[PDB]
């Protein structure tokens, strides 16, 4: 019953610094089915057992999804820091929930849809867990002030990845958070 | 939990000075490394940013003439300064935060700082 056919297999995902979040309520959910996928190169699951899943019910699950580099991938995991942990996505140290990640390089990069993928390189601060951050003021590397414009000393937040592997390619990343105070296991 | 600036001195003008920031307390494999400077009676200058990852980021100001580099290994982040002038002359500071790139206003650890002087 849960649609996470909609989220798995969208023709473009979104930039990591405006990651996309589906909320799955009221459905069942066949876990090992995706578990035992050859599709994935990352399967990790964090406070639950990979092969316990269809066996647990949750209140609520979430699946946020977006591309990133492959060795950015070690960066989607509890206590984990760097560009894309500290100011794109970041998990909470106590999360429950799945990591699954799959090359996307035939799908994303120039030999495919050539898509404009891009990450947010500069913050005056690190994100907070599940904290999403979209702005796109200049940032403000020294003291004097930028008045919105890259002078002296600002930058402009993001930049396009450029994708040129298998550490340097696009993966699709979809990460499914498990919200227990309505989604449950055959 | 400690940074500690060393290499500072005179220098002649036109000449080059390295500065090295020791850290210790921690492996800076997860900290951003920045380095400031103070003349006297003028506000506090940023430098130059040396990232978690190496990749750096560096002051207009400076015309390309400084270069921040790290090595993790001895846990030391350089600040390597070519074409020295005499308004180059100050005290130089190394700082740290447990963040990708350095901020302005945000660093967490200072060190207590070197001068250099530029004849």
């Known amino acids: 019953l849960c649609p996470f056919g909609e989220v798995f297999n969208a023709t473009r995902f979104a930039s990591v610094y405006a990651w996309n979040r589906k909320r799955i309520s009221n459905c069942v959910a066949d876990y090992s089915v995706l578990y035992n996928s050859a599709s994935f190169s990352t399967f990790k699951c964090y406070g639950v057992s990979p092969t316990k899943l269809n066996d647990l019910c949750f209140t609520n699950v979430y699946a946020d999804s977006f591309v990133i580099r492959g060795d950015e991938v070690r960066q989607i995991a509890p206590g984990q820091t760097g560009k894309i942990a500290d100011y794109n996505y970041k998990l909470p140290d106590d999360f429950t929930g799945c990591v699954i990640a799959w090359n996307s390089n035939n799908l994303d990069s120039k030999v495919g849809g050539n898509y404009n993928y891009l990450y947010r390189l500069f913050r005056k601060s690190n994100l907070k867990p599940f904290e999403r951050d979209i702005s796109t003021e200049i940032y403000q590397a020294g003291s004097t002030p930028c008045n919105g414009v890259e002078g002296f000393n600002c930058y402009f937040p993001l930049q396009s990845y450029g994708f040129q592997g298998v550490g340097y390619q696009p993966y699709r990343v979809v990460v499914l958070s498990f919200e227990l105070l309505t989604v449950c296991g055959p | 939990l400690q940074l500690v600036e060393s290499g500072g001195g005179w220098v002649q003008a036109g000449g080059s000075r390295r500065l090295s920031c020791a850290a210790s307390g921690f492996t800076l494999d997860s900290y951003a490394v920045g380095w400031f400077r103070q003349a006297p009676g003028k506000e506090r200058e940023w430098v130059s940013c040396?990232?978690?990852?190496?990749?750096?980021y560096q002051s207009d100001s400076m015309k390309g003439r400084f270069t921040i580099s790290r090595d993790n290994t001895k846990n030391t982040v350089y600040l390597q300064m070519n074409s020295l002038k005499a308004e180059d002359t100050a005290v130089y500071y190394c700082?740290?935060?447990?963040?990708?790139?350095?901020?302005?206003?945000?660093?967490?650890?200072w060190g207590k700082g070197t001068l250099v002087t530029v004849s």
């Open positions: 700082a740290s935060r447990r963040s990708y790139g350095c901020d302005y206003y945000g660093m967490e650890y």
């Open positions: 040396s990232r978690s990852d190496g990749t750096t």
